[PDB]
Amino acid sequence: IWRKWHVKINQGQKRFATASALAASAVAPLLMARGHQVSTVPEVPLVVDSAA
Amino acid sequence: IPPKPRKILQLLRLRQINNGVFVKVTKATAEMIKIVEPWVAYGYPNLKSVRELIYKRGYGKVNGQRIPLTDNAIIEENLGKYGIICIEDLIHEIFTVGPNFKQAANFLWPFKLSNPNGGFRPRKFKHFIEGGDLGNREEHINALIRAMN
Amino acid sequence: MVAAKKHVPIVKKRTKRFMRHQSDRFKCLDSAWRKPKGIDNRVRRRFKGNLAMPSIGYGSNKKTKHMMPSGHKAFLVHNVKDVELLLMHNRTYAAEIAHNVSSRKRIDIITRAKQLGVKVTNAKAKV
Amino acid sequence: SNVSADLIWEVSRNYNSFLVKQRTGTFSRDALNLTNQHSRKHAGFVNDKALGIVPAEKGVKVIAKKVKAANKPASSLYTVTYKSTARKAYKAIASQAAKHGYRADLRQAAVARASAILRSQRPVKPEPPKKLRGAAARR
Amino acid sequence: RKAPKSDNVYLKLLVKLYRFLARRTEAPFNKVVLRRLFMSRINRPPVSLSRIARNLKNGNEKKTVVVVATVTDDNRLLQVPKMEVAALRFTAKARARIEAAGGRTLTLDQLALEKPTGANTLLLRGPKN
Amino acid sequence: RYAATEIAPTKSARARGSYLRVSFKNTRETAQAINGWKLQRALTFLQNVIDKKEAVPMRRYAGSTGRTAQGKQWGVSRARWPVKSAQFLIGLLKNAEANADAKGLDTGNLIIKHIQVNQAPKQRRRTYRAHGRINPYMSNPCHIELILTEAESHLSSRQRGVRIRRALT
RNA sequence: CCCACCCAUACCCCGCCCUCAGGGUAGAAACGAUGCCCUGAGGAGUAGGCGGCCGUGGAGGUCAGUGACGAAGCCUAGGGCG
RNA sequence: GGGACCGAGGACCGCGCUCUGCAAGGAUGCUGGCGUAAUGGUCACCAGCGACCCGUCUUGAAACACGGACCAAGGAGUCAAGGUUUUGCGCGAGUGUUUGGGUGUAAAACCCGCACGCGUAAGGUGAGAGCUUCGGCGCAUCAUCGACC
RNA sequence: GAGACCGAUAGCGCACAAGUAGAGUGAUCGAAAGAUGAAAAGCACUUUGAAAAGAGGGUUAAAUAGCACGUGAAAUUGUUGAAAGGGAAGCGCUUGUGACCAGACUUGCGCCCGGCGGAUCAUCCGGUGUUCUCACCGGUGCACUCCGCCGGGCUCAGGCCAG
């Protein structure tokens, strides 16, 4: 059971990776490369109204 | 082969077998060749031998590379600063041992000759003076060269 | 079209397989080639009259490699999307339907490939 | 900025959802790939200016990327369907790729793709009857 | 070395840019920059604001100090002078102090734009020992 | 299922026996003895073997078998009388003949087209042996099957010209 | 003593594989730049060192992958690639 | 004059010549038969030539010795702690959230208070990469003379 | 309640009437062993056999699933087919014979005629889109211009082996 199942990652690196993932999600070709069918959707960083 | 002959062969640029080169006759070079007596056959080449060796099996050392000597432009770009601008100039410098013979010889890649047409003498590993093929054949090296080419 | 692109003649330096040593004598040793590590083994030391050893010297020509005797390179296709993927390489690639494709899907693949001009390696499997 | 076609190629040259890889070659399923080959030259989703030709019911539908609309996928592709003459489609496609400097390196590939799609739309010849040989023939 | 050991796409882009520059220019500046981009982290020690300040204390003011390394802040300096610094990466305090002194932070691609042959550039390295 | 699957089942007769407690080697030898014969000849031969009037040749499994003049009928010296195997084959041959009678085939023109003896799963016994060992006595049973059946151009232009000329002249 | 002849993986010429070395390739009609083009040289190998590939069980993503019109396994004096 | 083996490359570029062209930086032209098992390939056998039975162990090497009836499946440098070298990554005189606490779509993910671990609180002579307004500036580091604790 | 675990030589010794069968005076030691089929629909009846079973027949999608039951390898064996064999076989190179096979080709392109049959000849006008000069529709075109077919002719390129 003592196999060291968990990995300790610096929180700064975790936040760096999250920021990079957010920028990639903002990028439009990267969605198509990841396999998302985004062709009938405008404004890749979609903002839908909070009142809706 | 002992280390002294091993070093002399390396310096005469005779790394392979049937691997002729040109040497300027001098006390130091003659002593080197005389020490390496048991492994090489050497002699005095003539104009036809030099001309055919340069024309048929003439390659140049260009930036450390073997380039077939198909162009007087190659000859000029490599030996032009010594006044050698053509293959006729190179043949003349080799035959009539000129001031830049060292430069011409080194530019010439060692000639990779084929085995003689007709073979060597029945036992090739004695001296020419004892019915073999080794050593100093003064003018018969020409016939050996025609056999080699 | 059906005819492949013009190419240099296909030369194969060696046509028979590289048989593992003593695989003829033992049934537990499969014929797949294995490197013999014995320091006295004659096949490793390369004594004459023994089995040959694979080497990069037997490598096939770079501009001829991986192509069939017809001159096409095989491409494993599973569906009509794969043959439409081969659309642009009519004279260079041939289509090979995967073994797990059903009869109707094979019929559709052959139909689309014959529309596209793409050669089919196994066009007559389930006919 | 931080993103460009070079960055996208850096991220995606080793793996795509469009990437199919076999022993005889590497291909791409991307609709903006004129030769279905994995390369920066032909990576349509990577390059800012790109072309793609798809079959229509009778003719060819040509899509081109709008550089002022990369952020808007629903309005990012200039689509024109050319359903007139083979020679006229080639003329128009070669102009869309080479006259005003939008991918003249892809002009030849685009014309070839249009030609291939039209030949595919052309009616197809019946098979020659199969001839048996040797043991099968005598069997 | 032909391919960098790093997996950083932006360092790869810089490597391509400076490879093109080294091939198409007579600049030993570009050649050395490409070599220092290829070397690893332990061979690219940090350069401090103190080291740069005393390397500009002489008549080398009003210049572009290029360091292929990370520039670190030094608390031992009460004052930072105006200076044209370009480097791979800065610390937050190094950026803040340089920008408060009145200099400008510069990246290596920018330095390639303004100074593609290394003119008026002071090329510096950090302490190895 | 039967090994010989090339025989149509409507024109032949068949018989099978499985897990038969008889020596596999002797049964194989006597099956080879009667293979390819007519039914009456085989039945008479098997009865003669039981009566020790004729013996089967031992071909493969023939270790240390005495020599008998009867073996001269086979051009061999090692002949032996496997009574038990003979009785088993008589039983199966009579069953096959009865199946032929049911099917309506002519019994006087039947030959033993196929006969096969295979090894059945081995059975166990144990006996007491010296030096602390127990000697296993696996018996060696066999399967038997048999089937009886009724006994019943691209020539060259030069070649084409040569043939035309030779035909005319 | 003399002449001709026989042949080694040796030597000479040519092709092909790989490795190494030296060059070219962006106001991009532009590229699996980890690519392609040119030139030259080299090739035994134990301990050992380095690299790239092949295969197995399971996990995340993806191919809107295959499949009772037959997945997987298994057999094959039937083929293709390396 | 006779014979053999080979034809790599794939628009033009070059060196040349005997220049309306050419044997000059690598083969074209003409023709015939067949267009199918004909070439080609895989198996089995014959034929000529070649060819010690594998591994371990010892020794300078052999020989000896040891293991090997056959097949299927299983089968042997792994995990943890503590050191240390190198490579990649983040922050950088600082660095480390995950003891614990606060959220949570709940063993995930996200956030954090006070501690704590480890680390941190001056030259001359000559070279020298790289710049230069070509007058000279001079990283790192080195040899010597230095300065201070 | 769960798992980036194992999947019947694995995982607890035990997925089964397993701490069972069995061994030991006793303390104790301690296995092997899962799978028909959707549903038994687990073969009525006839015939041979003393019987076990066999052969017909029948159930089933399947008996190439018959409670020796999913799939069913190798070692080993039988039968048939082909072949080899004067004191070992097996293996490498190269033919030859016999048997058995994968490819390749079935014509493609382009010009000269005639017959046609149709719909998207050039230019111009409006709208739309766009890389702001390129296109797309709708009208115009009225068929010495386009686009497909047929009956012919010619060119070039096409497979194998060769001179």
Side-chain angles (χ1 to χ4, degrees), chain C residues 29-53:
Chain C
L29 308 172
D30 168 69
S31 296
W33 166 252
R34 293 278 176 293
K35 182 68 179 294
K37 322 282 189 191
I39 196 61
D40 295 334
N41 201 232
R42 311 197 150 263
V43 174
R44 189 197 57 87
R45 291 176 70 101
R46 261 187 294 260
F47 273 102
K48 74 181 267 192
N50 278 269
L51 284 152
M53 279 176 101

PDB file of all heavy atoms in Angstrom, chain C residues 29-53:
ATOM      1  N   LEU C  29      11.080 -23.218 -30.138  1.00  0.00           N
ATOM      2  CA  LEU C  29      11.700 -22.017 -30.676  1.00  0.00           C
ATOM      3  C   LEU C  29      10.986 -21.622 -31.962  1.00  0.00           C
ATOM      4  O   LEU C  29      11.102 -22.311 -32.979  1.00  0.00           O
ATOM      5  CB  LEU C  29      13.187 -22.245 -30.940  1.00  0.00           C
ATOM      6  CG  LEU C  29      14.010 -22.817 -29.789  1.00  0.00           C
ATOM      7  CD1 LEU C  29      15.408 -23.166 -30.261  1.00  0.00           C
ATOM      8  CD2 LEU C  29      14.064 -21.830 -28.638  1.00  0.00           C
ATOM      9  N   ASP C  30      10.246 -20.520 -31.911  1.00  0.00           N
ATOM     10  CA  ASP C  30       9.558 -20.022 -33.087  1.00  0.00           C
ATOM     11  C   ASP C  30      10.568 -19.443 -34.076  1.00  0.00           C
ATOM     12  O   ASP C  30      11.666 -19.021 -33.707  1.00  0.00           O
ATOM     13  CB  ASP C  30       8.512 -18.978 -32.682  1.00  0.00           C
ATOM     14  CG  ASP C  30       7.961 -18.206 -33.861  1.00  0.00           C
ATOM     15  OD1 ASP C  30       7.239 -18.810 -34.683  1.00  0.00           O
ATOM     16  OD2 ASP C  30       8.239 -16.995 -33.964  1.00  0.00           O
ATOM     17  N   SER C  31      10.183 -19.434 -35.351  1.00  0.00           N
ATOM     18  CA  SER C  31      11.088 -19.059 -36.428  1.00  0.00           C
ATOM     19  C   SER C  31      11.456 -17.581 -36.436  1.00  0.00           C
ATOM     20  O   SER C  31      12.354 -17.197 -37.191  1.00  0.00           O
ATOM     21  CB  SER C  31      10.471 -19.430 -37.778  1.00  0.00           C
ATOM     22  OG  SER C  31      10.314 -20.831 -37.895  1.00  0.00           O
ATOM     23  N   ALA C  32      10.786 -16.749 -35.642  1.00  0.00           N
ATOM     24  CA  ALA C  32      11.101 -15.328 -35.610  1.00  0.00           C
ATOM     25  C   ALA C  32      12.552 -15.110 -35.206  1.00  0.00           C
ATOM     26  O   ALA C  32      13.065 -15.763 -34.293  1.00  0.00           O
ATOM     27  CB  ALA C  32      10.171 -14.594 -34.646  1.00  0.00           C
ATOM     28  N   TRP C  33      13.214 -14.184 -35.895  1.00  0.00           N
ATOM     29  CA  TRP C  33      14.644 -13.987 -35.711  1.00  0.00           C
ATOM     30  C   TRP C  33      14.956 -13.498 -34.303  1.00  0.00           C
ATOM     31  O   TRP C  33      14.265 -12.628 -33.766  1.00  0.00           O
ATOM     32  CB  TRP C  33      15.180 -12.986 -36.730  1.00  0.00           C
ATOM     33  CG  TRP C  33      16.544 -12.496 -36.381  1.00  0.00           C
ATOM     34  CD1 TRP C  33      16.876 -11.262 -35.914  1.00  0.00           C
ATOM     35  CD2 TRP C  33      17.765 -13.237 -36.460  1.00  0.00           C
ATOM     36  NE1 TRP C  33      18.228 -11.184 -35.699  1.00  0.00           N
ATOM     37  CE2 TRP C  33      18.797 -12.385 -36.027  1.00  0.00           C
ATOM     38  CE3 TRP C  33      18.086 -14.538 -36.854  1.00  0.00           C
ATOM     39  CZ2 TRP C  33      20.126 -12.790 -35.980  1.00  0.00           C
ATOM     40  CZ3 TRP C  33      19.406 -14.937 -36.806  1.00  0.00           C
ATOM     41  CH2 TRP C  33      20.409 -14.068 -36.374  1.00  0.00           C
ATOM     42  N   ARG C  34      16.002 -14.062 -33.710  1.00  0.00           N
ATOM     43  CA  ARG C  34      16.519 -13.609 -32.427  1.00  0.00           C
ATOM     44  C   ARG C  34      18.032 -13.497 -32.519  1.00  0.00           C
ATOM     45  O   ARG C  34      18.683 -14.328 -33.157  1.00  0.00           O
ATOM     46  CB  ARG C  34      16.115 -14.554 -31.293  1.00  0.00           C
ATOM     47  CG  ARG C  34      14.629 -14.550 -31.004  1.00  0.00           C
ATOM     48  CD  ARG C  34      14.277 -13.374 -30.111  1.00  0.00           C
ATOM     49  NE  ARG C  34      12.848 -13.252 -29.853  1.00  0.00           N
ATOM     50  CZ  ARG C  34      11.937 -12.940 -30.764  1.00  0.00           C
ATOM     51  NH1 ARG C  34      12.270 -12.686 -32.018  1.00  0.00           N
ATOM     52  NH2 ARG C  34      10.659 -12.872 -30.405  1.00  0.00           N
ATOM     53  N   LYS C  35      18.580 -12.472 -31.883  1.00  0.00           N
ATOM     54  CA  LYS C  35      20.015 -12.225 -31.917  1.00  0.00           C
ATOM     55  C   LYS C  35      20.728 -13.221 -31.012  1.00  0.00           C
ATOM     56  O   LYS C  35      20.470 -13.235 -29.803  1.00  0.00           O
ATOM     57  CB  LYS C  35      20.297 -10.799 -31.463  1.00  0.00           C
ATOM     58  CG  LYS C  35      21.750 -10.366 -31.488  1.00  0.00           C
ATOM     59  CD  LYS C  35      22.288 -10.259 -32.896  1.00  0.00           C
ATOM     60  CE  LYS C  35      23.737  -9.807 -32.874  1.00  0.00           C
ATOM     61  NZ  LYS C  35      23.883  -8.418 -32.367  1.00  0.00           N
ATOM     62  N   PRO C  36      21.619 -14.058 -31.538  1.00  0.00           N
ATOM     63  CA  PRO C  36      22.325 -15.016 -30.682  1.00  0.00           C
ATOM     64  C   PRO C  36      23.458 -14.351 -29.916  1.00  0.00           C
ATOM     65  O   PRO C  36      24.350 -13.728 -30.497  1.00  0.00           O
ATOM     66  CB  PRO C  36      22.856 -16.054 -31.678  1.00  0.00           C
ATOM     67  CG  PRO C  36      22.954 -15.328 -32.965  1.00  0.00           C
ATOM     68  CD  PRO C  36      21.890 -14.275 -32.968  1.00  0.00           C
ATOM     69  N   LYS C  37      23.415 -14.492 -28.592  1.00  0.00           N
ATOM     70  CA  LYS C  37      24.363 -13.841 -27.698  1.00  0.00           C
ATOM     71  C   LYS C  37      25.484 -14.764 -27.235  1.00  0.00           C
ATOM     72  O   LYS C  37      26.320 -14.344 -26.430  1.00  0.00           O
ATOM     73  CB  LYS C  37      23.634 -13.269 -26.482  1.00  0.00           C
ATOM     74  CG  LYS C  37      22.272 -12.675 -26.785  1.00  0.00           C
ATOM     75  CD  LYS C  37      22.400 -11.291 -27.397  1.00  0.00           C
ATOM     76  CE  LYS C  37      21.047 -10.609 -27.506  1.00  0.00           C
ATOM     77  NZ  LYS C  37      21.112  -9.372 -28.332  1.00  0.00           N
ATOM     78  N   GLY C  38      25.518 -15.997 -27.711  1.00  0.00           N
ATOM     79  CA  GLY C  38      26.588 -16.931 -27.323  1.00  0.00           C
ATOM     80  C   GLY C  38      27.942 -16.469 -27.821  1.00  0.00           C
ATOM     81  O   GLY C  38      28.029 -16.098 -28.997  1.00  0.00           O
ATOM     82  N   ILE C  39      28.975 -16.529 -26.988  1.00  0.00           N
ATOM     83  CA  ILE C  39      30.328 -16.008 -27.360  1.00  0.00           C
ATOM     84  C   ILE C  39      31.029 -16.991 -28.294  1.00  0.00           C
ATOM     85  O   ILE C  39      32.022 -16.608 -28.928  1.00  0.00           O
ATOM     86  CB  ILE C  39      31.172 -15.732 -26.101  1.00  0.00           C
ATOM     87  CG1 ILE C  39      32.389 -14.855 -26.402  1.00  0.00           C
ATOM     88  CG2 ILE C  39      31.568 -17.026 -25.406  1.00  0.00           C
ATOM     89  CD1 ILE C  39      32.032 -13.494 -26.939  1.00  0.00           C
ATOM     90  N   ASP C  40      30.523 -18.210 -28.382  1.00  0.00           N
ATOM     91  CA  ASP C  40      31.157 -19.231 -29.239  1.00  0.00           C
ATOM     92  C   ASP C  40      30.220 -19.574 -30.382  1.00  0.00           C
ATOM     93  O   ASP C  40      30.609 -20.390 -31.220  1.00  0.00           O
ATOM     94  CB  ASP C  40      31.473 -20.489 -28.438  1.00  0.00           C
ATOM     95  CG  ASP C  40      32.508 -20.273 -27.346  1.00  0.00           C
ATOM     96  OD1 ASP C  40      33.332 -19.347 -27.491  1.00  0.00           O
ATOM     97  OD2 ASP C  40      32.477 -21.030 -26.357  1.00  0.00           O
ATOM     98  N   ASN C  41      29.025 -18.997 -30.393  1.00  0.00           N
ATOM     99  CA  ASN C  41      28.059 -19.359 -31.414  1.00  0.00           C
ATOM    100  C   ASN C  41      28.588 -19.010 -32.801  1.00  0.00           C
ATOM    101  O   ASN C  41      29.036 -17.891 -33.066  1.00  0.00           O
ATOM    102  CB  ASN C  41      26.728 -18.648 -31.166  1.00  0.00           C
ATOM    103  CG  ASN C  41      25.566 -19.333 -31.851  1.00  0.00           C
ATOM    104  OD1 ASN C  41      24.797 -18.703 -32.573  1.00  0.00           O
ATOM    105  ND2 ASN C  41      25.428 -20.634 -31.624  1.00  0.00           N
ATOM    106  N   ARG C  42      28.525 -19.992 -33.696  1.00  0.00           N
ATOM    107  CA  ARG C  42      29.003 -19.819 -35.058  1.00  0.00           C
ATOM    108  C   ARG C  42      28.154 -18.850 -35.868  1.00  0.00           C
ATOM    109  O   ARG C  42      28.699 -18.130 -36.710  1.00  0.00           O
ATOM    110  CB  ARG C  42      29.067 -21.171 -35.772  1.00  0.00           C
ATOM    111  CG  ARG C  42      29.769 -22.248 -34.969  1.00  0.00           C
ATOM    112  CD  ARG C  42      30.183 -23.412 -35.846  1.00  0.00           C
ATOM    113  NE  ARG C  42      31.390 -24.062 -35.349  1.00  0.00           N
ATOM    114  CZ  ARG C  42      32.613 -23.815 -35.798  1.00  0.00           C
ATOM    115  NH1 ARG C  42      32.831 -22.931 -36.758  1.00  0.00           N
ATOM    116  NH2 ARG C  42      33.642 -24.470 -35.270  1.00  0.00           N
ATOM    117  N   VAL C  43      26.871 -18.754 -35.588  1.00  0.00           N
ATOM    118  CA  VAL C  43      25.981 -17.836 -36.342  1.00  0.00           C
ATOM    119  C   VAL C  43      26.303 -16.406 -35.919  1.00  0.00           C
ATOM    120  O   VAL C  43      26.366 -15.567 -36.806  1.00  0.00           O
ATOM    121  CB  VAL C  43      24.501 -18.243 -36.175  1.00  0.00           C
ATOM    122  CG1 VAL C  43      23.555 -17.241 -36.811  1.00  0.00           C
ATOM    123  CG2 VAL C  43      24.247 -19.636 -36.716  1.00  0.00           C
ATOM    124  N   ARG C  44      26.631 -16.168 -34.648  1.00  0.00           N
ATOM    125  CA  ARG C  44      27.024 -14.811 -34.188  1.00  0.00           C
ATOM    126  C   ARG C  44      28.410 -14.449 -34.717  1.00  0.00           C
ATOM    127  O   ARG C  44      28.577 -13.319 -35.177  1.00  0.00           O
ATOM    128  CB  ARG C  44      27.092 -14.677 -32.664  1.00  0.00           C
ATOM    129  CG  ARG C  44      27.284 -13.245 -32.190  1.00  0.00           C
ATOM    130  CD  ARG C  44      27.747 -13.103 -30.756  1.00  0.00           C
ATOM    131  NE  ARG C  44      28.993 -13.796 -30.476  1.00  0.00           N
ATOM    132  CZ  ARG C  44      30.202 -13.290 -30.657  1.00  0.00           C
ATOM    133  NH1 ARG C  44      30.353 -12.075 -31.150  1.00  0.00           N
ATOM    134  NH2 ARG C  44      31.266 -14.008 -30.356  1.00  0.00           N
ATOM    135  N   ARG C  45      29.358 -15.382 -34.674  1.00  0.00           N
ATOM    136  CA  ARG C  45      30.758 -15.107 -35.090  1.00  0.00           C
ATOM    137  C   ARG C  45      30.828 -15.018 -36.620  1.00  0.00           C
ATOM    138  O   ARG C  45      31.865 -14.562 -37.104  1.00  0.00           O
ATOM    139  CB  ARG C  45      31.670 -16.145 -34.433  1.00  0.00           C
ATOM    140  CG  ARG C  45      31.792 -16.008 -32.925  1.00  0.00           C
ATOM    141  CD  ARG C  45      32.632 -17.124 -32.345  1.00  0.00           C
ATOM    142  NE  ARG C  45      34.032 -16.992 -32.712  1.00  0.00           N
ATOM    143  CZ  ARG C  45      34.974 -16.500 -31.919  1.00  0.00           C
ATOM    144  NH1 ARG C  45      34.669 -16.094 -30.698  1.00  0.00           N
ATOM    145  NH2 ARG C  45      36.222 -16.426 -32.343  1.00  0.00           N
ATOM    146  N   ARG C  46      29.799 -15.465 -37.334  1.00  0.00           N
ATOM    147  CA  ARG C  46      29.676 -15.297 -38.813  1.00  0.00           C
ATOM    148  C   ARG C  46      30.577 -16.259 -39.569  1.00  0.00           C
ATOM    149  O   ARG C  46      31.199 -15.838 -40.541  1.00  0.00           O
ATOM    150  CB  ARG C  46      29.841 -13.843 -39.254  1.00  0.00           C
ATOM    151  CG  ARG C  46      28.529 -13.119 -39.503  1.00  0.00           C
ATOM    152  CD  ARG C  46      28.821 -11.760 -40.098  1.00  0.00           C
ATOM    153  NE  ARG C  46      29.513 -10.940 -39.121  1.00  0.00           N
ATOM    154  CZ  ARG C  46      28.934 -10.006 -38.381  1.00  0.00           C
ATOM    155  NH1 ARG C  46      27.646  -9.749 -38.526  1.00  0.00           N
ATOM    156  NH2 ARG C  46      29.649  -9.322 -37.509  1.00  0.00           N
ATOM    157  N   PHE C  47      30.608 -17.507 -39.143  1.00  0.00           N
ATOM    158  CA  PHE C  47      31.340 -18.534 -39.868  1.00  0.00           C
ATOM    159  C   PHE C  47      30.613 -18.878 -41.160  1.00  0.00           C
ATOM    160  O   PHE C  47      29.381 -18.829 -41.226  1.00  0.00           O
ATOM    161  CB  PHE C  47      31.503 -19.783 -39.006  1.00  0.00           C
ATOM    162  CG  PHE C  47      32.709 -19.753 -38.118  1.00  0.00           C
ATOM    163  CD1 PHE C  47      32.588 -19.461 -36.772  1.00  0.00           C
ATOM    164  CD2 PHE C  47      33.965 -20.018 -38.630  1.00  0.00           C
ATOM    165  CE1 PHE C  47      33.694 -19.436 -35.956  1.00  0.00           C
ATOM    166  CE2 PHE C  47      35.077 -19.991 -37.816  1.00  0.00           C
ATOM    167  CZ  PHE C  47      34.939 -19.700 -36.478  1.00  0.00           C
ATOM    168  N   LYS C  48      31.379 -19.217 -42.193  1.00  0.00           N
ATOM    169  CA  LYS C  48      30.785 -19.499 -43.491  1.00  0.00           C
ATOM    170  C   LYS C  48      29.944 -20.768 -43.435  1.00  0.00           C
ATOM    171  O   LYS C  48      30.193 -21.674 -42.636  1.00  0.00           O
ATOM    172  CB  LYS C  48      31.868 -19.630 -44.561  1.00  0.00           C
ATOM    173  CG  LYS C  48      32.667 -20.912 -44.490  1.00  0.00           C
ATOM    174  CD  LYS C  48      33.725 -20.952 -45.573  1.00  0.00           C
ATOM    175  CE  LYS C  48      33.211 -21.657 -46.812  1.00  0.00           C
ATOM    176  NZ  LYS C  48      34.306 -21.964 -47.769  1.00  0.00           N
ATOM    177  N   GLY C  49      28.930 -20.822 -44.292  1.00  0.00           N
ATOM    178  CA  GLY C  49      28.014 -21.941 -44.317  1.00  0.00           C
ATOM    179  C   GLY C  49      26.897 -21.885 -43.302  1.00  0.00           C
ATOM    180  O   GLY C  49      26.161 -22.866 -43.165  1.00  0.00           O
ATOM    181  N   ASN C  50      26.735 -20.771 -42.596  1.00  0.00           N
ATOM    182  CA  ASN C  50      25.740 -20.639 -41.543  1.00  0.00           C
ATOM    183  C   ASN C  50      24.656 -19.648 -41.956  1.00  0.00           C
ATOM    184  O   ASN C  50      24.730 -19.003 -43.005  1.00  0.00           O
ATOM    185  CB  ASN C  50      26.401 -20.210 -40.233  1.00  0.00           C
ATOM    186  CG  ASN C  50      27.003 -21.373 -39.480  1.00  0.00           C
ATOM    187  OD1 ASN C  50      26.348 -21.985 -38.639  1.00  0.00           O
ATOM    188  ND2 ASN C  50      28.256 -21.688 -39.780  1.00  0.00           N
ATOM    189  N   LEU C  51      23.639 -19.538 -41.106  1.00  0.00           N
ATOM    190  CA  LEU C  51      22.530 -18.629 -41.356  1.00  0.00           C
ATOM    191  C   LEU C  51      23.004 -17.183 -41.375  1.00  0.00           C
ATOM    192  O   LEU C  51      23.889 -16.790 -40.611  1.00  0.00           O
ATOM    193  CB  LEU C  51      21.452 -18.808 -40.289  1.00  0.00           C
ATOM    194  CG  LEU C  51      20.566 -20.047 -40.403  1.00  0.00           C
ATOM    195  CD1 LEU C  51      20.073 -20.465 -39.033  1.00  0.00           C
ATOM    196  CD2 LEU C  51      19.393 -19.771 -41.322  1.00  0.00           C
ATOM    197  N   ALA C  52      22.406 -16.389 -42.257  1.00  0.00           N
ATOM    198  CA  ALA C  52      22.752 -14.980 -42.351  1.00  0.00           C
ATOM    199  C   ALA C  52      22.157 -14.208 -41.182  1.00  0.00           C
ATOM    200  O   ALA C  52      21.249 -14.683 -40.499  1.00  0.00           O
ATOM    201  CB  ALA C  52      22.261 -14.398 -43.675  1.00  0.00           C
ATOM    202  N   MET C  53      22.673 -13.016 -40.958  1.00  0.00           N
ATOM    203  CA  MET C  53      22.184 -12.197 -39.859  1.00  0.00           C
ATOM    204  C   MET C  53      21.616 -10.898 -40.404  1.00  0.00           C
ATOM    205  O   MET C  53      22.243 -10.279 -41.275  1.00  0.00           O
ATOM    206  CB  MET C  53      23.315 -11.902 -38.882  1.00  0.00           C
ATOM    207  CG  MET C  53      23.584 -13.030 -37.902  1.00  0.00           C
ATOM    208  SD  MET C  53      24.994 -12.706 -36.831  1.00  0.00           S
ATOM    209  CE  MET C  53      24.166 -12.190 -35.345  1.00  0.00           C
TER     210      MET C  53
END
